[PDB]
């Protein structure tokens with residue numbers, strides 16, 4: 479149960495990751511969350527990633543590989559893991575292959591959550607996120623029970639700094655450029671599985687369960 483999620487901005491990685499963690503009991507590793515936390519604490523890593531994140535650009539490969547290697551060396555990952563948003567370039571995928579061969583934990587599947595770019599701006603412009611637990615809502619497609627508050631913990635919802643329309647536009651263009659190379663890389667490895675992410679959330683998850691419930695230790 480060593481899984482990677484890939485998708486264009488707003489395609490649903492975090493929403494599906496939360497459901498995967500709850501059903502299969504593996505830890506969630508999100509590079510976006512790691513960088514935004516370091517930004518928040520203003521660590522040197524934080525301050526250095528911020529210039530890229532704010533513009534909607536990729537943080538450089540070397541630093542991102544490093545935080546992922548460190549995270550994967552923790553003991554929770556022995557049973558599996560769900561990488562979310564990493565790799566997102568070919569060079570990050572090649573490093574991860576090498577790390578995971580050294581660790582003895584090769585990827586079982588890379589799940590690509592496919593959504594038309596033309597749907598993604600509306601997903602991100604309506605996204606409202608819990609300041610406490612990070613879960614995401616959408617004003618129309620997945621609202622909280624009470625506006626402005628998270629259902630789980632009563633935390634204040636906020637708008638991610640990079641979800642402004644002109645940032646979303648750059649994020650889409652930056653990540654669309656990596657898409658073909660990365661799908662070729664993992665299809666040629668025979669670990670890529672695509673899912674149609676333009677369905678109701680529970681229907682996307684049903685397809686994820688066909689894939690992950692088919693794995694056996």
Ligand SMILES: Nc1ncnc2c1ncn2[C@@H]1O[C@H](COP(=O)(O)OP(=O)(O)OP(=O)(O)OP(=O)(O)OP(=O)(O)OC[C@H]2O[C@@H](n3cnc4c(N)ncnc43)[C@H](O)[C@@H]2O)[C@@H](O)[C@H]1O
Nearest residue numbers: 487488489490491492493509510531537563605615616619
């Ligand atoms: N490896 C790496 N290398 C270098 N730089 C890196 C890096 N990783 C990260 N970075 C940097 O960090 C930045 C942020 O990375 P990251 O945090 O990974 O952002 P991302 O990849 O753009 O993905 P998002 O979190 O925006 O979208 P999501 O697909 O998780 O959508 P969600 O489930 O929330 O859902 C979106 C919205 O839609 C709603 N929704 C979800 N599913 C559905 C559905 N099926 N139908 C309708 N609405 C839906 C939700 O409620 C929500 O409102 C990057 O831009 C880069 O600068």
Ligand SMILES: [Mg+2]
Nearest residue numbers: 491492493510
């Ligand atoms: Mg996310």
Ligand SMILES: [Zn+2]
Nearest residue numbers: 608611628631
């Ligand atoms: Zn919350």
